[PDB]
Short mmCIF file of C-alpha atoms and ligand atoms in Angstrom, two decimals:
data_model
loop_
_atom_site.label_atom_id
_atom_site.label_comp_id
_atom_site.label_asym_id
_atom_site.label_seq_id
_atom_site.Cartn_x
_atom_site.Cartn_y
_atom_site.Cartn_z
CA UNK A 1 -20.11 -1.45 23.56
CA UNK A 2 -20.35 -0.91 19.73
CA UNK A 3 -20.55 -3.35 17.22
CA UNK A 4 -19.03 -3.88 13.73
CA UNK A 5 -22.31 -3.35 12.26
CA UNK A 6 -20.84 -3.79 8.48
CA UNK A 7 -19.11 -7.07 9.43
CA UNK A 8 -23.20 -8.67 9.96
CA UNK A 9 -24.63 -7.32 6.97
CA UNK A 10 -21.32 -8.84 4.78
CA UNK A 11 -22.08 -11.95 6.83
CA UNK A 12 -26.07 -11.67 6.23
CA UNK A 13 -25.68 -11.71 2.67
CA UNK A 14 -23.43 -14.87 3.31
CA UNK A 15 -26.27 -16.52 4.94
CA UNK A 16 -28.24 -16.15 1.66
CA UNK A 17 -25.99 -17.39 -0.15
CA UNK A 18 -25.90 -20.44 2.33
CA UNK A 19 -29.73 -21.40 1.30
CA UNK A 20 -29.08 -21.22 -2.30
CA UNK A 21 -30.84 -24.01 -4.47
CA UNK A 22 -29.89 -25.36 -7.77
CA UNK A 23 -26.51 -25.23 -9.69
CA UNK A 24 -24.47 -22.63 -8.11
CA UNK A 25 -21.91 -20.31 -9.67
CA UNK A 26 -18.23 -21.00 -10.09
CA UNK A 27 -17.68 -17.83 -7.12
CA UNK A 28 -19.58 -19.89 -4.87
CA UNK A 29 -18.66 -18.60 -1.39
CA UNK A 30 -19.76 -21.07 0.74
CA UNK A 31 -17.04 -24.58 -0.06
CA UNK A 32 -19.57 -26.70 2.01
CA UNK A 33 -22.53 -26.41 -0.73
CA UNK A 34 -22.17 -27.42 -3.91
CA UNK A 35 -24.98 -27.92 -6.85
CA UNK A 36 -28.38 -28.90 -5.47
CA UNK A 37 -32.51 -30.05 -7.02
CA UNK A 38 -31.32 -29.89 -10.23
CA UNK A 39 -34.74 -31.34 -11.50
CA UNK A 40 -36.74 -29.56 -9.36
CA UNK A 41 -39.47 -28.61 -12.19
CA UNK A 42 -43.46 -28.00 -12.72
CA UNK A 43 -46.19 -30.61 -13.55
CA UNK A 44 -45.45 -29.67 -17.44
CA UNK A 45 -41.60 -30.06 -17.54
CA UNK A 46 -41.06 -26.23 -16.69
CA UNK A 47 -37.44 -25.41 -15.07
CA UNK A 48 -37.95 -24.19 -11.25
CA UNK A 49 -33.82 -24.86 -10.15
CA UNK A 50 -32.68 -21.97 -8.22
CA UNK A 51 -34.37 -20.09 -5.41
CA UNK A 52 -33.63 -20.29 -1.44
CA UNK A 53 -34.36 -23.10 0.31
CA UNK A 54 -36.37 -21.89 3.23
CA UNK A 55 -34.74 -22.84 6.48
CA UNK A 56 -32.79 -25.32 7.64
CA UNK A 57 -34.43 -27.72 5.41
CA UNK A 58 -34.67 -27.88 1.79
CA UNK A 59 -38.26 -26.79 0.83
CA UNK A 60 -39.16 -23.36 -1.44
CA UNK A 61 -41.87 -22.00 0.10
CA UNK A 62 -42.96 -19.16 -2.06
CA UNK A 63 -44.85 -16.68 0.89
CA UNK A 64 -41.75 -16.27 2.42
CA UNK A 65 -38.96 -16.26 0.00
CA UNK A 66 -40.89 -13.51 -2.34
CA UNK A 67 -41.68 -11.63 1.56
CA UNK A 68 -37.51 -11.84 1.91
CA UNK A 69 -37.28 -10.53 -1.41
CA UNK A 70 -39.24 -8.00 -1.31
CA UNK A 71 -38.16 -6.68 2.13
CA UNK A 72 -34.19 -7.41 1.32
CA UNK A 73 -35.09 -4.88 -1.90
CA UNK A 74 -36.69 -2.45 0.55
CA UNK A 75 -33.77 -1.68 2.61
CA UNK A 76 -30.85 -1.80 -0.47
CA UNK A 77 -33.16 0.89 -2.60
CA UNK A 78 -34.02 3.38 0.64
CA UNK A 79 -31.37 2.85 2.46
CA UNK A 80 -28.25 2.57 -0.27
CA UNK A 81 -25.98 4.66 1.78
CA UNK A 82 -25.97 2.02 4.50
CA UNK A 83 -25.71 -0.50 2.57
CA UNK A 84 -23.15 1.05 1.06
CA UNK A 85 -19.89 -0.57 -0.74
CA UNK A 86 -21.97 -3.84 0.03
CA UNK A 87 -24.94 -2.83 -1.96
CA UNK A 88 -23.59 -4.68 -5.17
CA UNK A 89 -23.33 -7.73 -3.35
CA UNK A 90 -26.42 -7.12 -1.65
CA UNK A 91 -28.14 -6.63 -5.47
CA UNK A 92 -26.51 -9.97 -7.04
CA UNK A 93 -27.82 -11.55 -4.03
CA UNK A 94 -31.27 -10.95 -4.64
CA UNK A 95 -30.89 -11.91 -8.13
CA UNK A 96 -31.05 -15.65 -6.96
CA UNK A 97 -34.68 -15.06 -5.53
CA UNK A 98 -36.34 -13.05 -8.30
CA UNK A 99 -34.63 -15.53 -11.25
CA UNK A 100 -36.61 -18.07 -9.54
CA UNK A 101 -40.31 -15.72 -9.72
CA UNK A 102 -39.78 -15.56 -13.04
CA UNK A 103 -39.58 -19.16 -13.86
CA UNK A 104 -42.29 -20.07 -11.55
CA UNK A 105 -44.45 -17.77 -13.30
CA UNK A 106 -44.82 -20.40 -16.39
CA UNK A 107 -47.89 -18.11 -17.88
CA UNK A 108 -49.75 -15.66 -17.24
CA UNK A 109 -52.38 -17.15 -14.56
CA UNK A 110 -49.97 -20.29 -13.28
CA UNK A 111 -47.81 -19.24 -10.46
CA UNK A 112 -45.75 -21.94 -8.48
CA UNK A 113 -45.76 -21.67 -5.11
CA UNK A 114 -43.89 -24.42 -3.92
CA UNK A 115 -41.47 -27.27 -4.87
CA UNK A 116 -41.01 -30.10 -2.07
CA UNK A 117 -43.65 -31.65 0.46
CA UNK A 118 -42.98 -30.40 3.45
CA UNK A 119 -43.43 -33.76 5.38
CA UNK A 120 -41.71 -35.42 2.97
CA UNK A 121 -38.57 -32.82 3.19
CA UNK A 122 -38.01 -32.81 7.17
CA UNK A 123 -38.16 -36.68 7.00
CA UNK A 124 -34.52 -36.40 5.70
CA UNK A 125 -31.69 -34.80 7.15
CA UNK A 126 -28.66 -34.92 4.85
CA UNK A 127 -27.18 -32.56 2.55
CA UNK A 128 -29.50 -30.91 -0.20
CA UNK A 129 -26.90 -32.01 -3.10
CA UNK A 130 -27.98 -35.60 -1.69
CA UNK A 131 -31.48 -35.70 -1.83
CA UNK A 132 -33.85 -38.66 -3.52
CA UNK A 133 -36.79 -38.23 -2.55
CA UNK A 134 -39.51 -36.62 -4.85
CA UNK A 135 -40.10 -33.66 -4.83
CA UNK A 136 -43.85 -32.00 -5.84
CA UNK A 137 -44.18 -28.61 -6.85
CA UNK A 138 -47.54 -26.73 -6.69
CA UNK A 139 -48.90 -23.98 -8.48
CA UNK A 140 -51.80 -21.37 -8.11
CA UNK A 141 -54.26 -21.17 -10.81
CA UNK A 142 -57.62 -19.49 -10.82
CA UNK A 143 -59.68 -22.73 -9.89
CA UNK A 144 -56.47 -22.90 -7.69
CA UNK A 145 -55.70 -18.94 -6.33
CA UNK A 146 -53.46 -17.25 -3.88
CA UNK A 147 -53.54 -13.66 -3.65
CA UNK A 148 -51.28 -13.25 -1.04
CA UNK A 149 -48.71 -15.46 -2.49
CA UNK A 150 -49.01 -13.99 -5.79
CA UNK A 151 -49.42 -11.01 -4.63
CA UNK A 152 -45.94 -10.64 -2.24
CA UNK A 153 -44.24 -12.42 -5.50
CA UNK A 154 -45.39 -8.98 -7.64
CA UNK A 155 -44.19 -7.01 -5.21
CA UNK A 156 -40.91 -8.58 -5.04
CA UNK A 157 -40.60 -7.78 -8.86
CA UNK A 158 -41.88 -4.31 -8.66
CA UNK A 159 -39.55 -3.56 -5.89
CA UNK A 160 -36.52 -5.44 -8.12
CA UNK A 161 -37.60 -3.11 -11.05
CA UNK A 162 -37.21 -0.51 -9.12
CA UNK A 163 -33.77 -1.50 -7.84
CA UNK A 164 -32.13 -2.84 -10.88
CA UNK A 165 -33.42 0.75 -13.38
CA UNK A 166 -30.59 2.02 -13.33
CA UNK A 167 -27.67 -0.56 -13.59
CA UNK A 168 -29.42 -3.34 -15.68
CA UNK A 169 -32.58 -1.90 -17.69
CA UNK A 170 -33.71 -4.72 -19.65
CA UNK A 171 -33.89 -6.78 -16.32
CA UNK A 172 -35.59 -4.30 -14.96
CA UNK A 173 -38.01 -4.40 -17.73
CA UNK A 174 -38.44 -7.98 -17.51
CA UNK A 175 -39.20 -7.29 -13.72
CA UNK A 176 -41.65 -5.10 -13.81
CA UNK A 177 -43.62 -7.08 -17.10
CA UNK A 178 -44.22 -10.45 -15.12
CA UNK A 179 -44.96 -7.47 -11.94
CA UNK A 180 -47.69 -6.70 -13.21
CA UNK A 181 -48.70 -9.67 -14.88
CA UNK A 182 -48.79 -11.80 -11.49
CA UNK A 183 -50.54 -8.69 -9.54
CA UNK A 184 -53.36 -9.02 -11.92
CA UNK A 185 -53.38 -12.85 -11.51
CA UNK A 186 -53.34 -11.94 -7.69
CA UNK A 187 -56.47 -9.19 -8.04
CA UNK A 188 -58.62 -11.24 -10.37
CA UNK A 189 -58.43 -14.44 -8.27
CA UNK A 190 -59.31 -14.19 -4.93
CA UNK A 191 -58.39 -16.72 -2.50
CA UNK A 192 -55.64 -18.19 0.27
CA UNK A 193 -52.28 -19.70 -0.96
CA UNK A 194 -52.02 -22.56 1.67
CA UNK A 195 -55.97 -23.81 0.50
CA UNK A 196 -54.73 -24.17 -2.76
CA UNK A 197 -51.17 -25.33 -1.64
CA UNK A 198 -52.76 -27.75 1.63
CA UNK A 199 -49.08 -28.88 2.16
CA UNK A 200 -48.33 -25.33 3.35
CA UNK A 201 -50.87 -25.01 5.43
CA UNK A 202 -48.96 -27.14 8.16
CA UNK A 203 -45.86 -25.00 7.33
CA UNK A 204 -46.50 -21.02 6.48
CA UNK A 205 -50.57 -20.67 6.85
CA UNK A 206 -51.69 -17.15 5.55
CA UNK A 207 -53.90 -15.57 7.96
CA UNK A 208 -55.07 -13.30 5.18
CA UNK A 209 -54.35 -11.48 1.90
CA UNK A 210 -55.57 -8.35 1.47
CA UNK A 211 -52.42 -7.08 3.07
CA UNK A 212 -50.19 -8.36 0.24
CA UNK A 213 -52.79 -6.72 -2.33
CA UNK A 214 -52.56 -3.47 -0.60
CA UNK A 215 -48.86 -3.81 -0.58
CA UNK A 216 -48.20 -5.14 -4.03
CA UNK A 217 -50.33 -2.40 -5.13
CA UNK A 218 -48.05 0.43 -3.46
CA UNK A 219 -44.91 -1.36 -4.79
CA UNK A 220 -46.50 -1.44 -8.15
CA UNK A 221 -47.52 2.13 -8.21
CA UNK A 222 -43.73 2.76 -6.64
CA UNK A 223 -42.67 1.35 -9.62
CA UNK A 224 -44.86 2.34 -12.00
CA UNK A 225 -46.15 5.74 -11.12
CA UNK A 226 -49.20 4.53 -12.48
CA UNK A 227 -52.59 6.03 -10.32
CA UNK A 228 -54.51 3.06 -10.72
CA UNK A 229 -52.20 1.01 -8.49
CA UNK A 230 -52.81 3.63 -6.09
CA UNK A 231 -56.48 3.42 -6.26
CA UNK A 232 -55.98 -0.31 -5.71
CA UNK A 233 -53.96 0.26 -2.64
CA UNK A 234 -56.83 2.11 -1.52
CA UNK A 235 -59.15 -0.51 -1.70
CA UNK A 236 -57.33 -2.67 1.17
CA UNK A 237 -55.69 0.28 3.68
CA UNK A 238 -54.87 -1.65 7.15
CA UNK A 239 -57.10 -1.32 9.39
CA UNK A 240 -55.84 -0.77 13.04
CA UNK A 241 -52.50 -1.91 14.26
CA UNK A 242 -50.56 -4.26 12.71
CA UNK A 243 -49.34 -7.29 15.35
CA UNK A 244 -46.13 -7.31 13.65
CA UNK A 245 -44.21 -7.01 10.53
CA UNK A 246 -43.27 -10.74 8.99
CA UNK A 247 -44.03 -12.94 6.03
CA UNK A 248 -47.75 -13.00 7.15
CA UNK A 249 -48.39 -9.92 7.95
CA UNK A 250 -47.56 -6.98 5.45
CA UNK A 251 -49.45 -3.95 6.71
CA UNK A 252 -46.90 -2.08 8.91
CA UNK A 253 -45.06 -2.33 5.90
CA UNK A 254 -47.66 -0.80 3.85
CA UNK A 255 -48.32 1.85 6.34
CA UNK A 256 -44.58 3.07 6.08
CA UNK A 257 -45.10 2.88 2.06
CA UNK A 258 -48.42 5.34 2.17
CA UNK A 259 -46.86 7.63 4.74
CA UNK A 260 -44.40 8.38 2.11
CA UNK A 261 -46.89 9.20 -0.17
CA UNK A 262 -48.41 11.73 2.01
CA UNK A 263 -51.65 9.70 3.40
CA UNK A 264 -52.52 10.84 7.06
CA UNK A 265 -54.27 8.20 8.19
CA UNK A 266 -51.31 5.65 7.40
CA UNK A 267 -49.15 7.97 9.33
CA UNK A 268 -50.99 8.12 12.60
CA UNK A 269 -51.11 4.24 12.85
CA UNK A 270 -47.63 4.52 12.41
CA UNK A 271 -46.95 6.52 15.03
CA UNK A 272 -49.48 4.36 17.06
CA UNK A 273 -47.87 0.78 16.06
CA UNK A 274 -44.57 2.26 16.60
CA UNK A 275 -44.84 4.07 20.26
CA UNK A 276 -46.08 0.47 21.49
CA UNK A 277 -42.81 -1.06 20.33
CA UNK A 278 -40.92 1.42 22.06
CA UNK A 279 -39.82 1.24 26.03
CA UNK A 280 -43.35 1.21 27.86
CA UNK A 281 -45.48 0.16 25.35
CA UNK A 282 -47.77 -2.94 24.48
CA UNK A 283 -44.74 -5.26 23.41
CA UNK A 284 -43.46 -7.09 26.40
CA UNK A 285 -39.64 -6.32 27.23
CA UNK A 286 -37.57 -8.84 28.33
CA UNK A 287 -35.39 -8.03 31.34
CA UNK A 288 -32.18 -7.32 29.33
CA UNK A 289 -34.66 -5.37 26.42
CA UNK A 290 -35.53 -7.62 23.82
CA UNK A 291 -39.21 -6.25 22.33
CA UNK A 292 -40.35 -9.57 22.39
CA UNK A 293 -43.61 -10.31 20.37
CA UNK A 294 -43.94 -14.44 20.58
CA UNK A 295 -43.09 -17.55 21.25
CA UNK A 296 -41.64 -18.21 18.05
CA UNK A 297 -38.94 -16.64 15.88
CA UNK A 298 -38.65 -13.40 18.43
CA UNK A 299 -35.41 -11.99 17.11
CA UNK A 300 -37.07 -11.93 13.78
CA UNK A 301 -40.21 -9.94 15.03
CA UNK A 302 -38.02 -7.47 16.75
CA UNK A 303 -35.79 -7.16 14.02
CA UNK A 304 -38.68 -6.79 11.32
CA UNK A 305 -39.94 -3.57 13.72
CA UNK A 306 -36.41 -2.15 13.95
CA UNK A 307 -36.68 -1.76 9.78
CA UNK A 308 -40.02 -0.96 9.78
CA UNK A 309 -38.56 1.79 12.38
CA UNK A 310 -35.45 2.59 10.53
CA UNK A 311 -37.61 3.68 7.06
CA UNK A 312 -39.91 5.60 9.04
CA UNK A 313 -37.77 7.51 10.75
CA UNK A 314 -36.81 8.48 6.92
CA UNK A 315 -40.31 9.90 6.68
CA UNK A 316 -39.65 11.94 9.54
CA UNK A 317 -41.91 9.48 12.03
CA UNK A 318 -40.47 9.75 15.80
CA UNK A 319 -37.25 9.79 14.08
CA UNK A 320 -34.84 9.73 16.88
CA UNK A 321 -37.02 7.43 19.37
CA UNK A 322 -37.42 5.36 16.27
CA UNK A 323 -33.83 5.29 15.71
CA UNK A 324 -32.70 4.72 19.35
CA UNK A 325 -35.36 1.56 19.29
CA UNK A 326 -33.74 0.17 16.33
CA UNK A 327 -30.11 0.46 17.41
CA UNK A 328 -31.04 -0.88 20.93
CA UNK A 329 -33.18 -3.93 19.37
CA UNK A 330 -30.16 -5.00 16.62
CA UNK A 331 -27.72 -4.45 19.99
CA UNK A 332 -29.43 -7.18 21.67
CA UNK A 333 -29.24 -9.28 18.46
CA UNK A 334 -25.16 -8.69 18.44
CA UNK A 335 -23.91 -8.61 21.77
CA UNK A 336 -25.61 -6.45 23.99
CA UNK A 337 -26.76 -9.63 26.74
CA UNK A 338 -22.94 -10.49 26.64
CA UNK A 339 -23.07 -13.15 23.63
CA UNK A 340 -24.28 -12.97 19.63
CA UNK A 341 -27.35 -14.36 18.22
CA UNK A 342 -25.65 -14.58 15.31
CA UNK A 343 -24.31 -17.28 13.81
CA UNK A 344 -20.30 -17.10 12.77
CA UNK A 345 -20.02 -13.35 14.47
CA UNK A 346 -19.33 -11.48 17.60
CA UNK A 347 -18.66 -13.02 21.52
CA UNK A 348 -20.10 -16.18 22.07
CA UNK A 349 -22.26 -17.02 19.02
CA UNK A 350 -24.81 -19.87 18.47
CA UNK A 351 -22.96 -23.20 17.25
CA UNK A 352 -25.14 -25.25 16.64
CA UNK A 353 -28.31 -23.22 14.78
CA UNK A 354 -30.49 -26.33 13.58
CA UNK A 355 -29.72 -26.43 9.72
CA UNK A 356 -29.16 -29.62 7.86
CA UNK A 357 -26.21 -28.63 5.35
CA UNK A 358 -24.28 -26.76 8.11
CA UNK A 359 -24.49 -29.72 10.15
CA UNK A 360 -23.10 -32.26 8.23
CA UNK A 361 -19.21 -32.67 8.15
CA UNK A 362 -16.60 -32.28 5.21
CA UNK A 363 -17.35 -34.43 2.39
CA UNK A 364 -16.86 -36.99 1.03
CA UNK A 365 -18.28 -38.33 4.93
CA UNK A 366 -21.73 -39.57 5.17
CA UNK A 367 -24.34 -37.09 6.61
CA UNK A 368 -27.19 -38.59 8.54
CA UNK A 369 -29.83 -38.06 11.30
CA UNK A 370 -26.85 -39.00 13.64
CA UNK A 371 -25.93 -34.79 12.84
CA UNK A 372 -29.11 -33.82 13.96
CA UNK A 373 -28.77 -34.62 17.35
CA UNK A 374 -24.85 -34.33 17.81
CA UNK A 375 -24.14 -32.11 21.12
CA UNK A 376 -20.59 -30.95 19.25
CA UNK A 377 -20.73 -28.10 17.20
CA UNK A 378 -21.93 -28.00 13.74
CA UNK A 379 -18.78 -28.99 11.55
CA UNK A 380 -19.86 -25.74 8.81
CA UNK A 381 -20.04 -22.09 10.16
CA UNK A 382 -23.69 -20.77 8.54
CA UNK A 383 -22.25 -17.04 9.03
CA UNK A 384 -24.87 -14.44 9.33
CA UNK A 385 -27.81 -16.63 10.46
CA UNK A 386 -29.96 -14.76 13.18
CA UNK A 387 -31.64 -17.65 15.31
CA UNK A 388 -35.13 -18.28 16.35
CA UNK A 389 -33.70 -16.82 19.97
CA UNK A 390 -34.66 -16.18 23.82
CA UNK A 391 -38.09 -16.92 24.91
CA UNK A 392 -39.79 -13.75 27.55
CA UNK A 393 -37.25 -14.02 30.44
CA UNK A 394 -33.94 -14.15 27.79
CA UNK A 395 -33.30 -17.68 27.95
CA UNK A 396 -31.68 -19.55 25.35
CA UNK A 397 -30.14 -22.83 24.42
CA UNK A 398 -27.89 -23.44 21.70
CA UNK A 399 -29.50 -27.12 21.13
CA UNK A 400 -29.76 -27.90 17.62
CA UNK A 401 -33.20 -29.63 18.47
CA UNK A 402 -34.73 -27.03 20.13
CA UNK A 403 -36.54 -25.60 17.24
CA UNK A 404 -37.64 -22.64 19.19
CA UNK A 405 -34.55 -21.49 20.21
CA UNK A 406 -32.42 -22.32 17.16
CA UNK A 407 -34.21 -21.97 14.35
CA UNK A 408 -32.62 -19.51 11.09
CA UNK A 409 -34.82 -18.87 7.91
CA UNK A 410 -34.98 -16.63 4.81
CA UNK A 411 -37.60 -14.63 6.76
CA UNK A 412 -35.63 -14.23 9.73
CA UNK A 413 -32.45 -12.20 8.16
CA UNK A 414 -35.11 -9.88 5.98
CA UNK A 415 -35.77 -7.42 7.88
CA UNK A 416 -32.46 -7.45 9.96
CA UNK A 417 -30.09 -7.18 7.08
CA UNK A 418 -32.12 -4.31 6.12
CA UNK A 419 -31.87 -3.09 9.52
CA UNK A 420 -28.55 -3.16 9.74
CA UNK A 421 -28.19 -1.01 6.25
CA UNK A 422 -30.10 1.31 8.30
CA UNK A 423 -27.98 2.22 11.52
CA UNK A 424 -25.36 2.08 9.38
CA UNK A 425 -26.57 4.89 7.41
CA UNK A 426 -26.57 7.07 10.66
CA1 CA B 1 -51.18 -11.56 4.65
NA1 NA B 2 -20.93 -8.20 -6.62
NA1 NA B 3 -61.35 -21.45 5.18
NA1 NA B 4 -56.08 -5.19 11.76
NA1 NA B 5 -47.31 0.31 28.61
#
């Protein structure tokens, strides 16, 4: 079959707007949220309302959202055809994420990484606007640093300056200034996010984070056309092939960035990480041919290769196996297996994708861990969501309690929205 392609990425961008934090605007889409963490704020009084809330719980974890960013900006700036008569939407949408850098970035060497305990968060399950329980935020410092953190944050502004030039210049501006402030910040102090930010080490744990300096770099020099963010880059190449594309990992990304800039090296590993994505490579196939790459969040790894696919099949990169891999990985995610892995679209889609707001009924009724566990559908349609999915043989439960299975995140819908820009550019 073929599937309405546009109809996800519309939906995608509904998702976002689904995991919105603080007071919302009067076009609101979604009628079952409603103004949220209104004193969510640093250890000196500082403003941090706004941002995503990460999953399907109410925490800001900053490696991820400013990864999301970064990677949502990716696709709407090289691949603005697909997204097309969407991309406006797609641009506003973003806006909520880097609004929120900017205020976490309270001078010129704090960065907050994080507002709510983790522990703390899952404990409750109710509807953000009805939270009462504190909530800490964390920053990085230099006694206190996190180069990868900080470092995918910069990019996400570099990339935003880069988007918003043309329609919105003094943004843009104010983009690019904390950019490069925070990259420095990121360069100068050397260290792990989640051991200055221990909560997150039981959440997102950065394996390392000289991939987000090497990437920041590129998007700063991107951005800036400056040579010494080049040089930087240089400093912190990937070495090998990357394991995937996600949150943790940024060098596939990276590789597709220094291809376009003509380095030779990054092109061969390309090539290399690519082919073993592809039918008969490394990356185990599921019988009905999901690339699947782990246990956990496997929709999301495939769909993260199908963009990093998609933009290098722009650099001229095995463009049509490249291409054929994409549209056969996003298939899977929209119908191909007979039913959607999306929530709110297509034949057969997930109903009960584990998310505390979406599971709670109409208000003014009381929302409680009773919703957690209820085997009816959740009451609220989180359109757009792409689940956790199928484990290595395709099987799948729609069991809000099976994490594995039913899982949706920031991170998850990255890469695919962007993916979905792409093939529709074709
Ligand atoms: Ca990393
Ligand atoms: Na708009
Ligand atoms: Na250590
Ligand atoms: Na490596
Ligand atoms: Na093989």
């Amino acid at each position: 079959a073929q599937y309405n392609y546009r109809e996800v990425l519309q939906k995608s961008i509904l998702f976002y707007a689904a995991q919105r934090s603080g007071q919302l605007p009067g076009n609101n889409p979604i009628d079952w949220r409603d103004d949220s963490a209104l004193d969510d704020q640093g250890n000196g009084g500082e403003d941090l309302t706004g941002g995503w809330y990460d999953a399907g719980d109410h925490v800001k974890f900053g490696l991820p959202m400013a990864w999301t960013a970064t990677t949502l900006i990716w696709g709407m700036i090289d691949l603005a055809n697909g997204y097309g008569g969407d991309r406006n939407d797609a641009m506003q949408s973003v806006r909520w994420a880097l609004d929120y850098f900017m205020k976490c970035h309270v001078s010129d060497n704090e960065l907050y990484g994080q507002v709510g305990d983790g522990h703390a968060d899952h404990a409750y399950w109710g509807r953000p606007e009805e939270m009462t329980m504190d909530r800490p935020a964390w920053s990085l410092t230099p006694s206190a640093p996190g180069s990868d953190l900080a470092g995918e944050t910069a990019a996400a502004l570099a990339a935003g300056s880069i988007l918003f030039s043309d329609s919105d210049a003094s943004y843009a501006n104010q983009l690019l200034d904390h950019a490069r402030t925070i990259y420095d910040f990121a360069y100068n102090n050397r260290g792990i996010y989640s051991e200055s930010i221990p909560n997150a080490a039981d959440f997102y744990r950065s394996s390392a984070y000289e991939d987000e300096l090497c990437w920041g770099a590129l998007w700063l020099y991107r951005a800036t056309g400056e040579q010494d963010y080049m040089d930087k880059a240089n400093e912190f190449l990937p070495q090998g092939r990357p394991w995937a594309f996600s949150w943790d990992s940024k060098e596939a990304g990276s590789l597709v960035l220094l291809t376009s800039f003509g380095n030779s090296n990054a092109r061969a590993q390309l090539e290399d990480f690519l082919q073993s994505w592809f039918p008969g490579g490394d990356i185990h196939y599921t019988p009905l041919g999901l690339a699947w790459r782990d246990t956990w969040g496997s929709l999301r790894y495939s769909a993260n290769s199908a963009f990093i696919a998609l933009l290098a099949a722009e650099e001229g990169v095995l463009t049509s196996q490249a291409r054929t891999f994409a549209r056969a990985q996003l298939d899977y995610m929209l119908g191909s297996t007979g039913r959607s892995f999306v929530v709110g679209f297509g034949t057969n889609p997930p109903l009960r994708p584990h998310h505390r707001a979406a599971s709670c009924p109409d208000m003014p009724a009381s929302c409680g861990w009773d919703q957690a566990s209820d085997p009816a559908p959740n009451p609220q349609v989180l359109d757009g969501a792409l689940v956790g999915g199928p484990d290595d043989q395709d099987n799948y439960n729609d069991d809000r309690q099976d994490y594995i299975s039913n899982e949706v995140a920031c991170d998850y819908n990255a890469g695919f929205q962007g993916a979905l820009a792409g093939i529709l550019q074709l």
